[PDB]
Design a protein around this ligand. Sequence first.
Ligand code: NYE
Length: 219
Amino acid sequence: ATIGRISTGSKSLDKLLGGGIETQAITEVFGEFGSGKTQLAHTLAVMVQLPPEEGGLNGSVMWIDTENTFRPERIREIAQNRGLDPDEVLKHIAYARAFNSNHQMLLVQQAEDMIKELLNTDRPVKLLIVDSLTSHFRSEYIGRGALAERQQKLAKHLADLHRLANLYDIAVFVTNQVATLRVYLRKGKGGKRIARLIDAPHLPEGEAVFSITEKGIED
Ligand SMILES: Nc1cc2ccccc2cc1C(=O)O
């Protein structure tokens, strides 16, 4: 289908990204604790539920959590501050906690069941979040003798995510620490945050400054 764009809530960040995050693509956001990557994930889980006129895609969300960072109270707060019903917004976020890298991989495969069920409805899955992509892979595969299998397993996981994104017109959004759009977050001045786009093949490298508010991400 046509490439849909989900607003991040920030006009500055959306301009940097070419209008927002894309369906049929993996957007990978990097940053240290406090850089705003989890705030962006929570904001996008709300924004995607809005109609296109308001920066969303009238969509449902699937969220894979590798380390206990999903906060339903933060969704409710962002939803209510954006004029949405907080309970309805939460009902349209399917949640899974992944306990290890094998289970994380299995969940991406299992997500296809619900994606297929909602595909021709009024609320198709339009956003699949994996927070935080490599935490289990880094913990489970230590050192020299483990790199080949860690890379093999991560490549398969990413291929599985790209397949769902392309086949079902979903924006895949992943968070991490240091063929996919890579955005680097950092602390800016006066409690603001900065996003830097690096090595995008068809978007200029640039920076966007944004704030974290009761609405989640905004300028
Ligand atoms: N069966 C499921 C699989 C998932 C896979 C990825 C993200 C969320 C998911 C939620 C469920 C659920 O039963 O609520």
